[PDB]
Design a protein around this ligand. Sequence first.
Ligand SMILES: [Zn+2]
Lengths: 102, 49
Amino acid sequence: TVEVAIRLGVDPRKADQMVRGTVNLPHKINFRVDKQANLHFIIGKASFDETKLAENYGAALDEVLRAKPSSSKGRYLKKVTVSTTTGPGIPVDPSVTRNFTE
Amino acid sequence: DVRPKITLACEVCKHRNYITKKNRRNDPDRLEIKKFCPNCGTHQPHKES
RNA sequence: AUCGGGGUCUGCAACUCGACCCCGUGAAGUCGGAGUCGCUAGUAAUCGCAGAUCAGCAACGCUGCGGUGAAUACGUUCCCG
RNA sequence: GCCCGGAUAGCUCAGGGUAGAGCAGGGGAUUGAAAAUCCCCGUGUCCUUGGUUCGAUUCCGAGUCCGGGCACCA
RNA sequence: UAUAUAGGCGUCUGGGGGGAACGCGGGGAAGUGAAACAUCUCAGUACCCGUAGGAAGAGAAAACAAAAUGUGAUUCCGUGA
RNA sequence: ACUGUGAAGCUCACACGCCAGUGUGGGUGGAGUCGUUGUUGAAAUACCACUCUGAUCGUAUUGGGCCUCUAACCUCGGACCGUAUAUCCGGUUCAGGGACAGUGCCUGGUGGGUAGUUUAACUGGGGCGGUUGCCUCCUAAAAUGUAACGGAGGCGCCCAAAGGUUCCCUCAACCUGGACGGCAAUCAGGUGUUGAGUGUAAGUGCACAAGGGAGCUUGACUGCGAGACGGACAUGUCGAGCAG
Ligand SMILES: [Zn+2]
């Protein structure tokens, strides 16, 4: 189906520059930094509920936004993708960080 | 430098309160000592910066 | 093979040092590198028997016997005498 | 202070699932006798520590010894 | 050399040089002090160049000020120091 | 998730390739793989989203490297004119070089060619040699202090316990008896009052222990500090006690 996969701009190879996401919001998930410095989460699709998935996604972002590495250099949230099973595109706007559900 | 100068900061308010020296080969890990912190007003754990 | 135990024979005498018998133990070894030896027919390959030396044997050595018995030789191009 | 390069067998030097080769040393070959050819050996903390991965000589971090170039007005 | 210009003729009107001090615009040292010396000072002094006037330069806010409805071109004196 | 907006099934081409064999499109027909799948470091390649490694394309931005051209600019190359005299100068024209060179501002190099200066003191004359700060002893003449290129040394550290506190103990040496074991290792008895030891030089001390052992801990604190030592000054040293 569809989910959330953010590209946090950090150096995964450095041990200090690591991320471990863990959020819980129904409207207890886990996340980690992959080899290519990618984060994985669970989200909905375009053909789904509007205020349900959006509200649940904010808590995951806040834990990640509070887990930004100290030594990270450059833009943090380079891109966000919530594409469906076959639906291409569906890229969210990385600028939005406050009042996501509106 | 065998015996470098180290600074101890409170674990609650994070104020640099003391400065001392330790051997970095005998004691390789960050020093942990209970010291009187004037800002808190009591004895709090202190750790090497 | 090695080792433990019990025995037989010669020898005055089997510890260093004989052979053989029985019981048990059961190592390496899966055909062997560069290299290298023997043989042209009853020969090579293989199988057993006897003699000398000798009290006993370390004989799997030496000298003879007989049994079953093969493949190959185009030719001096090359090594040795 | 900043940026690169080097550390691997007795010696020299190549290299995400292999630690290798020549000079060395040793035993045996070929020779009337040697060298070179041959065969087979033993040689090793991959500078020292930790990190990722099922796994690192190889990727990341710190440190030691070195070498080159540019900085340095208590 | 064509448009024409450089140039060539004729005629009027100006300039050149001097002076003791004072002025305006430029160029601009070292001896000395720092108990040494290079930043710094000496000093924009000594000296040099260009120009004046009886004086020269400046002068009429793209100014000060600080919530007071404050001053109101320039120049030169005394304080601020 | 796909299937007559036509699978398997065959057959046509290409790509890599260790041909291990996979991927892409093409032609006929007509219903596929697939889930626990069995070894697994890890699972299915059912598919999907992000993405690494290299190689391919495209748009938009963006920097360099070249070859021409004449028109800026350059020519002490030729010929005319100002000019009767002119190897000066200027102008016209032809022939070459050409956006290079030269120059202006900015910037990095080599730079005794030139300039301004530094290159210590003590010292049985100066040089060579040696020394320059702190700590301990003797000279030092029984308070403190006291010179010489007088006589001897040490320092520019170390310890997270080798600091704080509570409790306990007595060493070195010698004698005797013991498997290796010896002068000298571990064990037992006795004599033994300081001859041992105190991180590190020397001196003053310490057996009442400041020497040896063990448990808990961080006062190797914060705001202060009556009264003093020592001193040209600047420095330096001791301190009962109050509060947290
Ligand atoms: Zn505190």
